[PDB]
Amino acid sequence: MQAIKCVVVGDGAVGKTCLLISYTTNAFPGEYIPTVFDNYSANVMVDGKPVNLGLWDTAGQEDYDRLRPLSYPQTDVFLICFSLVSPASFENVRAKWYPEVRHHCPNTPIILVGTKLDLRDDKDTIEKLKEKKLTPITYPQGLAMAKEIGAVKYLECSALTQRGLKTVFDEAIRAVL
């Protein structure tokens, strides 16, 4: 049975730990959002074929540029993430995350993931962005960024509502098979 190492990267703002907790437990953690997600493995079935999916978090390493690549060797697929209501996190896909993933893992597939989909229509979120002359990231921007970095898919999801969430990890597995 094939084993798959998937590493999740991106800014602190994206909600990496919450995303992984909500996917693996099938529920938004709600009350308290834990800071620790330990390396995880589960059997999951994709297209009628069993797969052992391994997931590594990277939260806490965002300011340590030489420690982060210690997690990268022998990765089968990367999720490069940004929050749909943080234009700064979207730009860091191009400025920060894609350059180091490609330099250390030039032949590994990438999925571009926009998180916090539920907030893109939120009035309070939109207004606070407007006060800084910004707006949320929309679907065609994600398409254009995915093309620029050679991502094999662009996907949007919400840890809160679980919209699009299982699809993210299904497609990560299909990128390897």
Binding site: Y32, V36, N39, S41, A59, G60, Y64, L67, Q74
Partner: protein
């Protein structure tokens, strides 16, 4: 309530970390040093490169740090002082991180399937690589938990800032020590 949830996660993930390091030592390391089986010539007598100083890190958390953190369970606002008291012990994460690339290269180029076989033999969900990254993850995690405590402790919270300063200094020094 929120500072109680943070303290509980700190303690529960510390027990999990001690357990994980204990399993790694008594499985992947024990097979090399036991003399029970067959060590390829590329890793023979090289346990010290593969595992670095993870024995000494385990000894610190198992003998000292978990027990002292438990004593702070009802004192979350003061737990920053635990990291101040024991700041010198955290210097061995600098040693560990420096050695990590040499460890990974040795395993890839010379261990073959030796450790994959041990893993299947014992039924472990975690590869040797999954265990050996945990000290790197843990030493960058403490600062997140201390940051969260600062969002919900009053201003008798100088006994969080000083501990946070230590736990930002340590992973920065480890980072700056990499080639």
């Amino acid at each position: 309530r929120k500072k109680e949830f943070i303290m509980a996660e700190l303690l529960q993930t510390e027990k999990a970390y001690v357990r994980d390091l204990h399993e790694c030592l008594e499985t992947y390391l024990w097979e090399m040093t036991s003399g029970v089986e067959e060590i390829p010539p590329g890793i023979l007598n090289k346990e010290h490169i593969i595992f670095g100083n993870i024995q000494e890190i385990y000894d610190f958390h198992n003998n000292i740090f978990l027990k002292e953190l438990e004593k702070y369970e009802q004192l979350p606002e003061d737990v920053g002082h635990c990291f101040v008291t024991w700041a010198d012990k955290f210097q061995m994460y600098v040693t560990y991180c420096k050695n990590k690339p040499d460890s990974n290269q040795l395993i890839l180029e010379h261990a073959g399937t030796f450790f994959d076989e041990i893993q299947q033999r014992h039924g472990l969900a975690n590869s040797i690589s999954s265990y050996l990254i945990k000290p790197v993850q843990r030493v960058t995690k403490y600062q997140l938990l201390l940051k969260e405590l600062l969002t919900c402790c009053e201003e008798g919270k100088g006994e969080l800032k000083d501990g946070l300063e230590v736990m930002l200094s340590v992973p920065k020094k480890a980072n700056d020590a990499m080639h």
